[PDB]
Amino acid sequence: GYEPCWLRYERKDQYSRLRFEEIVAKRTSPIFQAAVEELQKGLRSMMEIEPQVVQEVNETANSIWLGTLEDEEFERPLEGTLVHPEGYVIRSDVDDGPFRIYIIGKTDAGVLYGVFHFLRLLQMGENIAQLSIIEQPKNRLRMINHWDNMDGSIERGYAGRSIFFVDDQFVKQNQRIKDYARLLASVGINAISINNVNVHKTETKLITDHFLPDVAEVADIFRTYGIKTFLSINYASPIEIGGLPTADPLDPEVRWWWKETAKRIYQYIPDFGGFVVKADSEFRPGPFTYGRDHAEGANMLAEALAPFGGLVIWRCFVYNCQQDWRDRTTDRAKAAYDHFKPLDGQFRENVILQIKNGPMDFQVREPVSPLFGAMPKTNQMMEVQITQEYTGQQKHLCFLIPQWKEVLDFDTYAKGKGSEVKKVIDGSLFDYRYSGIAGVSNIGSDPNWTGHTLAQANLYGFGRLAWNPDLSAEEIANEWVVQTFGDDSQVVETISWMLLSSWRIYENYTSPLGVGWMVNPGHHYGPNVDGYEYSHWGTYHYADRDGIGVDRTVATGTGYTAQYFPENAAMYESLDTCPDELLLFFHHVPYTHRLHSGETVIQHIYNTHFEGVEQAKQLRKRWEQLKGKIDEKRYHDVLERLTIQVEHAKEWRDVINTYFYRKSGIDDQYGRKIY
Amino acid sequence: GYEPCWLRYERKDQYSRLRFEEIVAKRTSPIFQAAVEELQKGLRSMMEIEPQVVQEVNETANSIWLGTLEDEEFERPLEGTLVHPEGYVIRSDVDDGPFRIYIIGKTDAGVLYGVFHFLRLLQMGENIAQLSIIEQPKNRLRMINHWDNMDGSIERGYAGRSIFFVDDQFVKQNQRIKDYARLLASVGINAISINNVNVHKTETKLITDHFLPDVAEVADIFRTYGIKTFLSINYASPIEIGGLPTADPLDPEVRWWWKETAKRIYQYIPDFGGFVVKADSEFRPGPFTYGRDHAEGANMLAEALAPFGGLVIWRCFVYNCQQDWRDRTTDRAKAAYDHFKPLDGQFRENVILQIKNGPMDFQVREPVSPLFGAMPKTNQMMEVQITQEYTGQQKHLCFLIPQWKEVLDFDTYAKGKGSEVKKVIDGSLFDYRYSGIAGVSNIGSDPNWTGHTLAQANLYGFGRLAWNPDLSAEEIANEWVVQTFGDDSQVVETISWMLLSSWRIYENYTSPLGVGWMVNPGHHYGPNVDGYEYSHWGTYHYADRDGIGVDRTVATGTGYTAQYFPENAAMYESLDTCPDELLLFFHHVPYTHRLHSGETVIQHIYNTHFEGVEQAKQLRKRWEQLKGKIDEKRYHDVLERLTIQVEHAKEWRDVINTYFYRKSGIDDQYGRKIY
Ligand SMILES: O=C(O)[C@H]1O[C@@H](O)[C@H](O)[C@@H](O)[C@@H]1O
């Protein structure tokens, strides 16, 4: 019914087989059982072998051994250096006898991640005669957030309907949820929230007996793949389901009601991860409704979960969603830092502030949120958007891994040089107890799971970066393409090229120089330069007949640059050093202002919009050269979306070029067609 | 549960009573019974009298006599001149004996309209000692179109939910539908379509046995008040409910299926009015879907209804709803004439083309649709929009009667001078068998029926103009206000002033000089200059840094002016004679172009937007001076909307002024505040 994505386990030829007679499973916990089952599946499918599962080694049998440190006869120095619970070692025995592969995990989940790594090696055709591998995740939380509603819709879902819910209930049975867990665990994802952060009427009851048995069945499947389950919650639940007159977190009965709710959930799900919370945002209720701050409001929930080891993931996407467009002092980009930096040191230790990559809202380019690096005493995790709300909605190709690496490698200088975002959220810089990264799911019930076949690369790559942010975009694309489309070197170079250039191509024909937006309101797809320009969401470009851009300087504008540490604040504050790609985010400038590229701002706009369309056509041409080397169905699936992309890109190009010709009155340098 | 609107029948003082002992009802048909009942109701409520109903006159009793010509002992010369079936005469007997009032109708419905006229006279405090009145409607069809959906919603409904439907069924019982019929009949409305022109899945079945008993119960109530019932239909019904493979009107089985459907409906409703049809518009299905023209498609339905006397009301709101904004040759304003003028002479005589007042879509100002006067061989009726989709959505006050009179009195010169639109649609100019006017309903389940209490004036005035287009706006406002709020001369002058100036006030702060639109897409409420400017609906202003407007001239633009007869075409074709209020509909001009008013276009925009807000404040101030002379509830109801209006008007003013300062770079002459 659906694609295997990157877990194809394609049958090898006769020159690429392995000889094994036994799999040694030293434990029989559900996680180990899932790990053995994946190994049997991959070996049968790739190697056409079915080794017998045993729980003690046969000293003359060729085998793969699965165990933790405490199951080892001899604990060797490599595995002895593991410190992370989900770490593992893979090593080939250097005896001249039988062939042995040891997969040694610090814990059961480490064996599962090691089993997927070993199968990854086989899919990629790597020689395993002499493996010596050690792997430990850098981020403790490696999470997916679902925006799924129980009516089956998905908020900002471009890949079909919910695979969890339909008709205000759980889908019964679950085979697809198991394969989804396999996919998530294969790239190391260890946590999931199954319901929309906008928690509506039915979804509020997910924390009540009416639905907890269903929640628990889903949690049972994920637990087997090392994944902890979370629920997004309605902060006003004490009123809406508890019959309380208030949801004030300082009200004693409210506090008790959340404690009782927590106790009840842990009776159904003893390892429940915790709650995700959108509060006091976009008209969703929160502590502010009762005159309290977010430390008071998070802490109350945190105390309810604390006896059970749960976590509060408190989202920092908070801002004035009723801004007066006339008010040029108010800057939405400043809101999250101004709201949360003052609260550093006031939160309970099982609270994690979840912060999007940028301070606005997942635009094709945004500078990094200044909150990263600014709260040494508070756990932080980054939120990225795998579903492409403003990056093409899986109609346009957009591999997001390069952008995420830019954010992850951005140096905040919080503790001087070498204070990259990745060190903030991996908890090493400030010693955070809990931290990491989360991504808003791009899947849905479409058979290819992500809408665009090539958007599978974004779910894959999210997981790889969450495991190790230092992985290059090039090697992540290489692994994904080889596993999903095979190892033909023309196929590999071509799709890797498409992926790696796709984000830049889409940026080129959409909003210029980091100013964001210029999208149709509502569904957010396609060009509309003035779409929100006189609205109340805080999203303005201020374009007029002379110039464009948001003045966020301290010298003459909103002062947003001061939220950065001095090295970055100065870079952005000055007109002459601000990087071109963010210029209009930080400065209001005349259309004739000359960029570092030598282009005027206006001619830059024309150039990237004309040239972006030419690059999308090139994306399609290169895919077409792969006909015959890709199966017909996926070939045509992707080709159809690239053609949709090329046609829509022409619209972006012409709407933006005409808008700006109409305003600026300045013609294209090269005389190209502006309507 | 709801307001009586203009049928308050307020108790008179002791110096304003009438003495009657009998009502003489010469017939006992349902219409007469409804007429007697209304007279008893009004006399009891106003006069505190309950004359006995009798069916033969008592020669010594003071009485009101109700009958048709054939019930008269003596048929007098006045009533003898009646020719229209719904005409009536009211005359006081000039005998010195008992007091007698005769209400003599050409038919039963004429007696009902005469009964409402007589009660209108009493409400207004007129001396009835010596009445001699003759009244005959000018428009044969005086119709209301409902945009009600069976889920209870109303498309472009700003006055609550449907009073007909809820939960995909009919509301059972019906008292409110009876009072609604009383209101419609009091202003002479004689036809109604109860369901949205956009006919969705459930609504398609309104022509099937599953719902026809319900339709018929509603039709029974309306029939008693002289109103014929119509249904809007889904042109694709032969496929969606009939199981046919096509809905091609030339397919023999499709033709038969509509004949059978017509026969079945007339078994439930023997005087069924007919069908309203939106076809080949806004993605709704029609003949074009099968490669046929609208004469072929209307005629097929017309033949199905013909044996039963039904009518096909075929809407002319047809256009390219997938226009390329780049294509400046295509002009949505030309579409209806180009589609239907070629078909003159091809339609069956029980087809009526229903044409909106203007060629775009009910904007605050549009020139008159050129189809009026252009089809001597085809019945035409005009469609107006009583619900205020683009004229303030009943948040802003907008009495539409002055605009409708401008359209009605517009001289097409189709047969030389004196070829006003009103003569086209009343059928006198071309001898149409069936013709008239329809209005899209502004009511809903709100207790005050129209959302804005003062929008009741629009339903009232629609009906009065449909009866007699020559009535002045001043006397319609005077009648409505006196009946709804009483006769205090400060109350009367004030509300009449508010009504009569409201449309101009709202135009002043919305789109300038007839160009239309500049509304938020989707719900269509409030300012958004570029809202549809790069969309596919054909609605562009072409504003740039130098100028604005649609060039619809023959000399250099779309040639739309040529659709008018020569006298109007030349007026609009020339830059110097085109009236200011339509200038940007017809010409693209520089912001510095000087109007007949002496204003430049840009300064005109600034002036009317600043001054419009000052006029809305004045609307509120004048209503406030009426406190104490209006009941508290309606006083506060209206005041709340006027305050909403004033605040929203400030938004319109500032968004449009800033947009145009940003584009034009030209400051306000007077130095007023432009953000
Ligand atoms: O992050 C959030 O909560 C919000 O992000 C926006 O990008 C999106 O339009 C919303 O659907 C969502 O609820």
Ligand SMILES: O=C(O)[C@H]1O[C@@H](O)[C@H](O)[C@@H](O)[C@@H]1O
């Ligand atoms: O007249 C029509 O059919 C259409 O008129 C528009 O003014 C309105 O936006 C639509 O809701 C409607 O269906």
